[PDB]
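Run log, item B.
One chain of 334 residues. Sequence copied directly from the ordering sheet:
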Amino acid sequence: PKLAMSVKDGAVGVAVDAPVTVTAGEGVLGSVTMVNSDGKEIAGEIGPDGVTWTTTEPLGYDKQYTINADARGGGVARANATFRTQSPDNMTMPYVMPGDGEVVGVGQTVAIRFDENIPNRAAAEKAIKITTNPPVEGAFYWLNNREVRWRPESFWDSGTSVDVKVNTYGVNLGDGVFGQDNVASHFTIGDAVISRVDDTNKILNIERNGEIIKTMPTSMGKDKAPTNNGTYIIGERFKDLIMDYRTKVQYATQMSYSGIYVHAAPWSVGAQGRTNTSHGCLNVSTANAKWFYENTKRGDVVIVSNTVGPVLPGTEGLGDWNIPWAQWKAGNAR
């Protein structure tokens, strides 16, 4: 009568992503019980041919378990193991942008922001199944020790499904940092809205699926405080906003982490379409701001051309698209 458990008496670091099993040859399992060191029984169940038992709930970090099994058959047999699971130095809890069931523009990238620095980026990337329909090739670039982005080579085709599954429970992400739980998000890609502006004209030209549907005159950033050139991904928006000068501002659709918004500037209508009078923001009229507030969604693009300012930095960001595919696809795990 032979018993075989998938863990060993006195083992340590048992993984909590995998179940524990107990099997038997030369006969048949009779009873198998597993309990944490506080007594609480852990759930498992014997299979329909009486030869394997598996746990049905998952194990917990920083626990000890005792499993007792016996098998009937030759005849009588017994097994015993007490072990500890992964005993993490630090739990880290990922979050995903965009959120579950959101509809987003063709420049939305898949963020995974951790709340702890991630020593082992490779493990973090391995733990992230992203599933696209229709499928398209993408890759992982990190903007810093806590946030990893994933996008395709070019902008999103409209009506693509994106399923993001971050599965870090039980995954050692380097130097004792393990995932606190799993998280998921499924979202769809909406209409291809892309707004455009050349510092030559200072006219913001909004396309919907390659066809213009609004224009507006903007006053961008002063020579001394210029609006960056390049592709910006839109993010948040606000009906109101204090900006820290300290003053209230309406209908702000955000373009960069660094504080560049399309927003309502009545004080500078005279300048819109003509001369750059702001510290970086796309100044437009209250009526046109409100339109931009109401007609774009997170993930929509804005592109800037011929300002005196630098390129929006790639890792900013919001600046994701500014990085050339070659480099991005290479990633920066090592």
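Observations after the first pass:
- The CA atoms of residues 165 and 184 lie 5 Å apart.
- The first helix runs from residue 121 to 126.
Flagged for discussion on Thursday.
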